[PDB]
Design a protein around this ligand. Structure first.
Ligand SMILES: CCCCCCCCCC(=O)N[C@H]1CCSC1=O
Ligand SMILES: CCCCCCCCCC(=O)N[C@H]1CCSC1=O
Ligand SMILES: [Co+2]
Ligand SMILES: [Co+2]
Ligand SMILES: [Fe+2]
Ligand SMILES: [Fe+2]
Lengths: 314, 314
């Protein structure tokens, strides 16, 4: 017992198997869904998540890590239902996803108070259930490291030191938010190897990507299919080059796929342009085959999808 | 019938009686309550709301207008419960309360889509019930009229023009947001007399306040008790001056009282410093008696608390 699973006994990290380290069963804006429920369709949402997960499993995915947290509409009971329907190993997290400011709740509250929220989810359980958080998720994006973003990062560090769960980040690959997240976490005493810096796959600036890896953290080549950020072929070229340059033991790969997401950008009519082949199994259809016919040994595949997740959670 | 009430048949505006135009039964951050329910206590929240409303009614309040909307934790079923327990006339609103950016939901969504949400609440009902919204609430504060804040303002104008419900605003009294809100709404073709520009009582700059009244809108002297914004006695002096200068036709008075609110600023420890006498009945204890001692007659009080709300909703 080591990594907590939704709706299951916890597992030892050696038993995680082939892992997708960053996918979403469902993403929504909490306040919008609360205020305007007519916009949403839970049956559709359930069907989509179950269908995607089932296809992932038939490609041999054993574990999915789902970093839906506050600000992305985390719902542990929804996650429970998808587990019961599929039998997936599902790792749920805690944390806060913001780009600018915290919710008004956090006015005149300390970093300690925020960390207490994360530690609650990890140690006690999530949203009144006994499903526990297996990692902390934090974000920064275009606005950079604002005061409140930094507060959340330091709170995540406190949670990691207390509970030893790893940290997954959302960053923007085109500013230095990823590097800064790494810096602040490590200065606060987080083991660099307990950090996945997210969304670095959004750039082909490999010098920047290697910088983070060199400082000891996993690098998230983690949005395969999201062409609007970076097209699949450039992602593949970047992935291949990083492998050839010796970085396979820092690489993590995923789709960031949202089986449903409520943002207007994800309207069906935009899909062909923005994310034509985006799904939870694209890497099996494209990336892994591509790697194998470009000289990449099976051992590297094992490293990225089994060994690295195992280390991360160890 | 043409003001909708929570849990009651709609009433004619002439029957609104003595009104508190801006009070909150309960405020919370949607995403925080959703993610960490352990932080909250609905029984306590209910008791607080019921007790405050009961005292208001003892002092002759017939109708309370509650501008709790998206971003402040509007919950129409909680509101229903308080109505059942008290018998108050309660006017619920629709709208969006943001200072900077919209929820991610609204990425690549039009102003029209926003207005449709408001119009849904007005014409169809709120959160899956048949309780309908009687006004739209919008906000701006220190960050000023941002792109997204502006979008919401324009959506409110669409809603008013379509349904004729009035608009209540939140503004920052020190940075012209209230005047800008008025300008944008009236430029869109909203009748100035269907706008309440909020939180103008937070300043004793009467030149600024008069500017807004002169352009035909109601002026919100509406945070009595919140000394951290402006002390009661200075509000009183400002209120009295405006009345002496003939402006009672535009004056609206309230507390902005929150029977519960979840922000750290409102920890009990802080109340004596920030808001010692803040409650839903302060104006009966202090303000109204003060005005009377200064020669303000019953008719003026009736204009402010009965006639003006009547006009607002007519
Ligand atoms: C029609 C399809 C277009 C793609 C949707 C727009 C891009 C959405 C990206 C997205 O899902 N971002 C969130 C969710 C998981 S991580 C994160 O920060
Ligand atoms: C210790 C008690 C002092 C309260 C300080 C916090 C002031 C909150 C005022 C307040 O209510 N502001 C928001 C929330 C409801 S409407 C609105 O615009
Ligand atoms: Co992300
Ligand atoms: Co306000
Ligand atoms: Fe994600
Ligand atoms: Fe308010």
């Amino acid at each position: 017992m080591r990594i907590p699973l939704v709706g299951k006994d916890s597992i030892e990290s050696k038993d995680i198997g082939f892992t997708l380290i960053h996918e979403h069963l469902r993403v929504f804006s909490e306040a919008v869904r609360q205020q305007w429920p007519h916009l949403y369709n839970e049956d559709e949402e359930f069907r989509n998540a179950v269908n995607e997960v089932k296809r992932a499993m038939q490609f041999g995915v054993k574990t999915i890590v789902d970093p839906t947290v506050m600000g992305l509409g985390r719902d542990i009971r929804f996650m429970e239902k998808v587990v019961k329907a599929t039998g997936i190993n599902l790792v749920a997290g805690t944390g806060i996803y913001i780009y600018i400011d915290l919710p008004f709740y956090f006015l005149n509250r300390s970093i300690d108070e925020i960390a207490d929220l994360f530690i609650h989810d990890i140690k006690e359980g999530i949203q009144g259930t006994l499903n526990k958080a297996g990692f902390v998720k934090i974000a920064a994006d275009e606005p950079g490291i604002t005061k409140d973003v930094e507060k959340v990062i330091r709170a995540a560090a406190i949670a990691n030191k207390e509970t030893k769960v790893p940290i997954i980040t959302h960053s923007n690959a085109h500013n230095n938010t990823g590097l800064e997240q790494q810096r602040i976490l490590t200065e606060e005493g987080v083991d660099p190897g307990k950090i996945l810096i997210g969304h670095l796959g959004d750039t082909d600036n490999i010098d920047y990507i290697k910088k983070i890896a060199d400082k000891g953290s996993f690098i998230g080549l983690d949005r395969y299919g999201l062409d609007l950020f970076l097209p699949v072929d450039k992602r593949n070229e970047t992935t291949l080059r990083l492998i050839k340059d010796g970085y396979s033991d820092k690489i993590m790969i995923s789709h960031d796929y949202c089986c449903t997401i409520d943002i207007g950008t994800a309207k069906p009519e935009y899909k062909p342009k923005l994310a034509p082949r985006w799904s939870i199994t694209l890497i099996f259809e494209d990336t892994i085959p591509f790697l194998k016919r470009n000289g990449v040994n099976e051992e590297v595949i094992a490293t990225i999808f089994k060994e690295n997740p195992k280390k991360f959670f160890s």
